[PDB]
């Protein structure tokens, strides 16, 4: 129960960190061109 | 035509995706588009199984990415290495719902990544890396960890359960033991696969359909009501890649694979040659589905006229009995290779023995270019190097001649710098090393040296 | 002409009947017309002995049927399988008055018919099946029983008395023990017989008259005052079915049959080759009437010029002494086969050794069609497939070439579906499997591939 809540919490954490890095990369490319 | 290459063809299936470069270098994460995830019924954070090349798998967590094409999959270098794939390869993907929390795992560092450090590997590297991450891992994964301005590569040596698990807070992590040799991983990294074989597209298909397909799906053949042949003879002139294909098949197949080398059997004492032979067929029988590859067949089974030894003749008799002894339920296939097919005892090419033959012949110009690409992939080439042109100037060259061409080219390139380097130095000056490259001129030189040879 | 095929001919006798399909699938019942029963002096419910192929017998109960032709016999699938016969075959029938109540019998299930069930096999299957039925059965019968929405095949493993008996109320039925492998029965089911040999009608007659006839009726020959020859050499080019005939003879003969394989004798140590040879002729002598078949004779008895080994020459000497050693009372016949008759030591073809020769040659167009029918009988063929046409386009092909043609055809058929099937799947999609069939087009393709080969 609490195990799946932990996994889900870490998975949510993962998704938001990928989203943060997508935007950083996107910004870098705009500055490049 | 398209039919004889059927079996090589990339399938337009939803779980077949093209490998592209990753945004973010988290070793356990791979990124799809959201419509792709919707299609495969994958929700954010699901655990997935990837299949790459050379029997490789990786277990990852799948995440959404709006910059990712529907037909593409983003994965960092570490995952690609574990799958033995490069950017542009196609891999297959499925849910992995069965995957349990690990009881313990054993990992060790690569040796050239640690010389020397006091630090506790668990505390400094692994605990922060795994902490509350619930990362999936597989036996044989290599992964990279950052810590305190240093990076350390680890290999997963053991998991329990095997071969994969999720590393939880309560999973015991062992990091203790002798560091893994980099050279040993570089040996494994460079196993031969099908993508190391140029110019044989049609023959790789014939082999896949006479060997892999009937060991993998014996149902197909029973359904339609036919026995697949059990003896496949590869033939062709020297250096066309028969032995290469043997190594690829060994590293790609899902069957048990037993190599017999002609000369090596023939180098044994009287009676020990026979014994080893029997043991090979016994082991394969026992471990079916299985492939026996007999490389350089002509060594052990020349025409019973050629061979003026009673033992040598006895050995051929033994082979034939072993071939015939393959009762139809064994799922054992015997491949063999030779550059002298006419030199083989004809009784071996009868029905139920080596009854199929594959010509690994001289490649054509397009094939030669494939070969040149494969061979130079790890080489430092200058921009002036036009391999297509080299392909066009190498008529009648086979794979081995193209390898040597590339060696000779390189050596010329080295020759060009011999005014800076002495035999007597212990060391090579770095700016000399980093500038070293093979030019077209070097290849031109090599080419011209090869017209004496041919 | 009609005389050289005399011995194959179906006899217009009252006890020779054509197998037709059965009204009612009771495994112990067979149906004749009433005038046929009257003719053979069989009354309703008499116990009868049927002879089918491959030495098979069945014991049945004979019943009247007004829908049955006088010249026909109705029998369900189960009985036909036990007789190794198909619809349209001719079988022989006699009263069986000698047949005793069984003291015990042992039967076991086929394994793919039972995985898994609690139930007591006796109580749930066998007691209701045998109850007050007084069924006749024979060791080696396979029979099917219904019970509670499931069907279970059993094999009769033992009877007492052997080999047949009637199962009475007081007969002990054992059903306990390890289930019988389906694959093992499918191996037996597919033993080679004479009906698996196409295009050799005249040579099967020569063999039947030089081998079966004089071992079965040595009186004929003593009456008329002549010794039958004892050495029969089959010859012909590769793949014409010499070894096939050896397997058929082994599965059809009423004699003791001992196979010697050339290469396999020749694969033995010095002295062990000789020993095995002596033991073969000793065993046959002891177990007469008997057949020794020496397959690939040329391996053990090449011209005493060819063979540069003293042991190899010693072996041939041993053969000749063993052949001559067949004193005229032994009732042992030696057959042998070779695709190289000129390569055999000529002393073996002298009087009293291999003094009769049978040419298992290249079949003609009609023969080729017979072969194609035999080979495809268990294959999934589409309706467009015209084998007569294939027969006509395969001049100079022999049996083995026709087998491979049919394999290549099938493989093309499979090739056509390779867009749905992956090497990496564990499974084959069923609608793919059920639709799989070999088309004429597939055969056309195969044919065209075979004109390089020839
Ligand atoms: N088809 C190919 N594609 C790529 N490289 C090849 C190919 N064929 C040969 N080479 C290169 O040449 C090397 C020697 O070839 P090898 O696989 O030994 O050929 P082979 O046919 O086994 N020789 P032989 O046993 O002399 O008949 C290979 O290991 C490759 O480095
Ligand atoms: N007369 C035939 N009728 C039906 N099938 C045949 C016939 N001859 C050959 N075949 C098929 O081809 C296969 C190989 O033939 P086989 O019986 O080995 O011939 P063989 O003459 O013994 N060969 P060899 O020993 O090379 O001279 C058989 O097992 C059949 O599958
Ligand atoms: Mg080689
Ligand atoms: Mg044969």
Residue numbers in the entry:
A (entry chain B): 76 to 108
B (entry chain A), C (entry chain A): 10 to 463
What's the publication's text?
Taking advantage of the pathogenic p97 mutants that are able to achieve uniform subunit conformation in the presence of ATP analogs, we successfully obtained crystals of VIMPx in complex with two ND1p97 mutants (residues 1−460), each carrying a single pathogenic mutation either in the N-D1 linker region (L198W, ND1p97L198W) or in the D1 domain (A232E, ND1p97A232E), in the presence of the non-hydrolyzable ATP analog AMP-PNP. The structural solution of ND1p97A232E alone allowed calculation of a difference Fourier map that revealed additional electron densities attributable to both AMP-PNP and VIMPx. For the first time, the AMP-PNP moiety bound at the D1 nucleotide-binding pocket was observed in a p97 crystal structure. The binding of AMP-PNP causes the N domain to move above the D1 ring, which was analogous but not identical to the Up-conformation previously observed in the presence of ATPγS (see Discussion section). To obtain an anchor point for sequence assignment of VIMPx in the complex, we also expressed and purified selenomethionine (SeMet)-derivatized VIMPx (SeMetVIMPx) for co-crystallization with ND1p97A232E. The anomalous difference Fourier map identified a large peak in the middle of the tubular VIMPx electron density, which was assigned to M89. Based on the position of M89, we built 33 residues (76−108) of VIMPx into the density, corresponding to helix H2 of VIMPx. (3) Binding between the two molecules is mediated by charged, H-bonding and hydrophobic interactions with a buried surface area of 759 Å2. (4) The orientation of VIMPx bound to p97 agrees with its topological position in the ER membrane, as the transmembrane helix immediately before the N-terminus of VIMPx would be in the open space above the hexameric p97 ring, where the lipid bilayer of the ER membrane would be located.
Mammalian p97 (also called valosin-containing protein or VCP, cdc48 in yeast, and Ter94 in Drosophila) is a highly conserved AAA (ATPases associated with various cellular activities) protein with a homo-hexameric ring structure; each p97 subunit is composed of two AAA ATPase domains (D1 and D2) preceded by an N-terminal domain (N domain). VIMP, also known as selenoprotein S, is a 21 kDa ER membrane protein. VIMP, together with Derlins, is thought to contribute to the association of the p97-Ufd1-Npl4 complex with the ER membrane, forming an ER membrane-associated module in ERAD. Here we show that VIMP has an essential role in recruiting p97 to the ER membrane.
